[PDB]
Design a protein around this ligand. Structure first.
Ligand SMILES: *[C@@H]1O[C@H](CO)[C@@H](O)[C@H](O)[C@H]1NC(C)=O
Ligand SMILES: *[C@@H]1O[C@H](CO)[C@@H](O)[C@H](O)[C@H]1NC(C)=O
Ligand SMILES: *[C@@H]1O[C@H](CO)[C@@H](O)[C@H](O)[C@H]1NC(C)=O
Ligand SMILES: [Cu+2]
Ligand SMILES: [Cu+2]
Ligand SMILES: [Cu+2]
Lengths: 258, 336, 343
């Protein structure tokens, strides 16, 4: 006494992964009791199918699509370019070596380290389903403060520890991670030499988390031209744009825009 | 062409949990492309159904069944009663305290043993608890020369750690665990300069891991009578058993069986080492009678040839003077 | 902050029809707050798109798709083939014409049945046809004792009503209906000067402007796509929901036409076979050849079953039919009379 399920009602979904790794592409109504005679289940990907940055998993044909214009996917990773507040999951724990006030202050564009002689640790406990890397841009103008970024293992066993000075603009750093629940540490302790410029960190990019992820509309002020963009390029100055735009509209003569 | 599959082919399964926590009990064929008109998916439990110990999740009706006779479920947890080798997942890391690399937690047998020499031997297990649970392990602490430390690291690797000494029995210990990727630590230091007595740990049981388990047939030498047993009771002595046995089968007279023995063993012939001599109390005349007795766990048959019998004894032999401070009566039963 | 939903999370839906009759095919998420950047709305069909029978409206491209195999759509209409109980919407009002309250149109089975006694039993249906359409129902008229009236009163209650007698087959009837709230009335009265009047397969067309494909009911199979009516599986063949073709049944099981499940063949009984006698031979002796009824649903292998009795012994025929002279008798020509022996 139920109508045959049209293409618009049933939504393909994967069954729970077994021990071996076999999944089934069962067809499910969007709400119970709607359809009957649903499409038969078929074999799915073996619990490890990942789509690179700029691509998403299309359940209809189990393959990676190139996304679309004006949308960034982030791939099988995450990104923390925003620092208006402390990002969720980041623990700005500060331990005296009172210096409770001193810690990694989250400035808007970048996070800044401590200037005094207090150990300030920026901890991120992340579970990686796939082996990946962590990338970030760190500014190290002064050598009095020591910058340490070491990856703790799944079994909490410690695992190159220190960083080199970043003269002439922001530099780029990247280390490999593992299958376990790697817990990233950022810590800076400043020697009390009576003098410093805090260490600055941006664009923390951790790959290999949560397997496949979906596309997102480009943030305001950013544009993407072709499909498959892992990031939305910044619109040029004197130009402006909005969410989802494939191009930046020119601005008025009596207006300026960074 | 494909035909509708009878109830012998489609098996109920749960879809991937969503953000809110809803699942669909989809009926999936065992092998692809064998039937159509499968049962409609229905609402599943909210991704947190945890059947208690001795129970398994029945897919036909989403409720915890009491399992069957002769099988255990272990509940939403695991057990590490076997210690012939290092169980999978355990890291018996050994590091110098400042070469003692040779020292580590050796899987001595049914119990694990700590290092006697002066070194740090850590027994690490990294288990991801999907649910809040506890760890229950029996630990033997014979001597205080070796200290025992048991601390649980949290998900962020951010840590009561010292354990109490155990006298007589094996004792019982338990702590609480959270939902993070907890890493259990078992380490022993041997700060004693002069020796030692190793520390023994058994029956490590962590609960709240996979939200659900499946009924397991009982191992040989173990019997389960009541359904829903979270463990299989060991068969007493002189009783053998096999897999899935509801009751322990009595053994033959010529065969002796240890507690929890899979198969019986033939009783050897009695030897001079089996019996021990002894002397009983004095009689009214002041003479004691010696009554040789076999050991309480005596294992040998009298019928087999080449077996020395219990020697004939009990001849009244005059007792020596009684204990100092004790004076005997006419019956020679000394009283204080 | 939100997602960019793929084709799997956004569904097309039509806006409310305005006065002019224009609709916008707006894109709607399946649940609120799940995605953004939905596809832009486009012009929809002018509030009057009516897919024909056997078709469903595809939202992706606004056109009538021919449905799938083994499934029917019924088009912009409804059907009332089932009559185990009174179907929803039917009012079986029975009133005395001037107690017969217990006498009304009864859901006899696959067909509804009229009251045999003298009373007014009205079967009324109130359906709001959104589109101009017709009604197609099959009515059995055995005898003229009970009259049959089928008049659809119109929207304003404003009112050839009598249906002529039906001979042999069930016959077919159809009248035209307008866009108003037409209220169908099936009433029968007995003059009591009986044989009840039966109605099957009431098909009203032009109701909802669009329907949805339905899986074929058990015992019914559809081969070609876009079938307004799902055909019936032949005898001795079983079927289930959504079957493209009927599965042949086992030899030991018998199945009636359009049967959901097969039934075990019972052992043959004395009642199954019927005696009979054939024509005479050259010598004038007829041979009796017992035969089984063609709906033979029993098996000879099963024990306790009486076989077809061995018959065929030549037995001399009686004198032939009057007016026929023989031993293959032929009609004696007119002008000569025969009693069976000579003409
Ligand atoms: C002492 O520590 C507290 C936080 O525990 C802090 O608020 C306070 O400012 C510290 N005292 C001084 C003198 O800095
Ligand atoms: C210490 O050295 C290596 C490992 O560092 C090991 O193979 C060796 O056996 C150790 N020495 C002794 C005396 O056990
Ligand atoms: C009058 O009609 C009612 C309604 O069915 C019925 O119950 C009653 O028996 C009738 N009275 C008669 C038949 O005398
Ligand atoms: Cu523009
Ligand atoms: Cu939906
Ligand atoms: Cu077939």
């Amino acid at each position: 006494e139920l109508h045959a399920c049209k293409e618009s009602e049933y939504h393909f979904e994967y069954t729970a992964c077994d021990s071996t790794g076999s999944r089934w592409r069962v067809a499910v109504p969007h709400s119970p009791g709607l359809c009957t005679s649903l499409p038969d289940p078929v074999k799915g990907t073996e619990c490890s199918f990942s789509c690179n940055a700029g691509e998403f998993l299309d359940m209809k044909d189990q393959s990676c699509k190139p996304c679309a214009e004006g949308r960034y996917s982030l791939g099988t990773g995450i990104r923390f370019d925003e620092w208006d507040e402390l990002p969720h999951g980041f623990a700005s724990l500060s331990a005296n070596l009172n210096c409770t006030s001193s810690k990694w202050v989250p400035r808007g564009d970048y996070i800044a380290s401590n200037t005094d002689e207090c150990t300030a640790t920026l901890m991120y406990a992340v579970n990686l389903k796939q082996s990946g890397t962590v990338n970030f841009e760190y500014y190290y103008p002064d050598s009095s403060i020591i910058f340490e970024f070491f990856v703790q293992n799944d079994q909490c066993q410690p695992s190159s520890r220190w960083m080199k000075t970043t003269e002439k603009g922001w530099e780029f750093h990247s280390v490999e991670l593992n299958r376990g629940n790697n817990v990233l540490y950022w810590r800076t302790t400043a020697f009390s030499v009576w003098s410093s410029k805090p260490v600055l960190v941006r664009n923390i990019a951790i790959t290999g988390v949560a397997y496949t992820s979906e596309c997102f509309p480009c943030k305001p002020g950013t544009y993407a031209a072709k499909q498959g963009s892992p990031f939305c390029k910044l619109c040029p100055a004197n130009y402006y744009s909005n969410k989802g735009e494939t191009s930046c509209h020119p601005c008025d003569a009596d207006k300026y825009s960074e | 062409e494909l035909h509708a599959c009878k109830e012998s082919e489609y098996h109920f399964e749960y879809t991937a949990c969503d953000s809110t926590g809803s699942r669909w009990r989809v009926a999936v064929p065992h092998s692809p492309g064998l039937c159509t008109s499968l049962p409609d998916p229905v609402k599943g439990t909210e991704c947190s159904f945890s059947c208690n110990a001795g129970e398994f999740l029945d897919m036909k009706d989403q409720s915890c069944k009491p399992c069957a006779e002769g099988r255990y479920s272990l509940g939403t947890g695991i057990r590490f009663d076997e210690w012939d080798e290092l169980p999978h997942g355990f890291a018996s890391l050994s590091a110098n305290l400042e070469n003692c690399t040779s020292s580590k937690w050796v899987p001595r047998g049914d119990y694990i043993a700590s290092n006697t020499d002066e070194c740090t031997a850590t027994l690490m297990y990294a288990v991801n608890l999907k649910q809040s649970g506890t760890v229950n392990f029996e630990y033997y602490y014979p001597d205080s020369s070796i200290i025992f430390e048991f601390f649980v690291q949290n998900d962020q690797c951010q840590p009561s750690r010292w354990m109490k000494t155990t006298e007589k029995g094996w004792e019982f210990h338990s702590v609480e665990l959270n939902r993070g990727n907890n890493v259990l630590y078992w380490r022993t230091t041997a700060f004693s300069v002069w020796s030692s007595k190793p520390v023994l740990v058994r029956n490590i049981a962590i609960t709240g891991v996979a939200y659900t388990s499946e009924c397991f047939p009982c191992k040989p030498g173990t019997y389960a009578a009541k359904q829903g047993s979270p463990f299989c009771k060991l068969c007493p002595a002189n009783y053998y058993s096999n897999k899935g046995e509801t009751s322990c089968h009595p053994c033959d007279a010529d065969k002796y069986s240890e507690k929890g023995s899979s198969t019986c063993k033939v009783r050897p012939a009695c030897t001079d080492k089996d019996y021990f001599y002894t002397h009983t109390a004095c009689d009214a005349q002041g003479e004691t009678q010696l009554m040789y007795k076999w050991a309480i766990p005596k294992i040998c048959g009298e019928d087999l040839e080449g077996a020395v019998k219990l020697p004939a004894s009990g001849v009244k032999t005059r007792c020596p003077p009684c204990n100092p401070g004790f004076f005997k009566t006419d019956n020679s039963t000394c009283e204080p | 902050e939100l997602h960019a939903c793929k084709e799997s999370e956004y569904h097309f839906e039509y806006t409310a029809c305005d006065s002019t009759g224009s609709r916008w095919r707006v894109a709607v998420p399946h649940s609120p707050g799940l995605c953004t950047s939905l596809p832009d709305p486009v012009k929809g069909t002018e509030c009057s798109f009516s897919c024909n029978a056997g078709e469903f409206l595809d939202m992706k491209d606004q056109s009538c798709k021919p449905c799938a195999e083994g499934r029917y759509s019924l088009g912009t209409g409804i059907r009332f083939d089932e009559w185990d109980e009174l179907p929803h919407g039917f009012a079986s009002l029975s009133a005395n014409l001037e107690n017969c309250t217990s006498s009304k149109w009864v859901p006899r089975g696959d067909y509804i049945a009229s009251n045999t006694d003298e009373c007014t039993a009205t079967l009324m249906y109130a359906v709001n046809l959104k589109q101009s359409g017709t009604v197609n129902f099959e009515y059995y008229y055995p005898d003229s004792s009970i009259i049959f009236e089928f008049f659809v009163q119109n929207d304003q209650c404003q009112p050839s009503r009598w249906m002529k007698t039906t001979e042999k087959g069930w016959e077919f009837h159809s009248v035209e209906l307008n866009r108003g709230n037409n209220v169908l009335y099936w009433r029968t009265t007995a003059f009591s000067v009986s044989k009840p009047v039966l109605v099957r397969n009431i098909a009203i067309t032009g109701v909802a402007y669009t329907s949805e494909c339905f899986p074929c009911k058990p015992g019914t199979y559809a081969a070609k796509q876009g079938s307004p009516f799902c055909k019936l599986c032949p005898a001795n063949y079983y079927s289930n929901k959504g079957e493209t073709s009927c599965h042949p049944c086992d030899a030991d099981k018998y199945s009636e036409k359009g049967s959901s499940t097969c039934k075990v063949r019972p052992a043959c009984t004395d009642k199954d076979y019927f005696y009979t006698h054939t024509a005479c031979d050259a010598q004038g002796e007829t041979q009796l050849m017992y035969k089984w009824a063609i709906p033979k649903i029993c098996g000879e292998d099963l024990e306790g079953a009486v076989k077809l009795p061995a018959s065929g012994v030549k037995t001399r025929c009686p004198p032939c039919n009057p007016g026929f002279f023989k031993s293959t008798c032929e009609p004696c020509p007119y002008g000569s009379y025969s009693n069976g022996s000579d003409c």
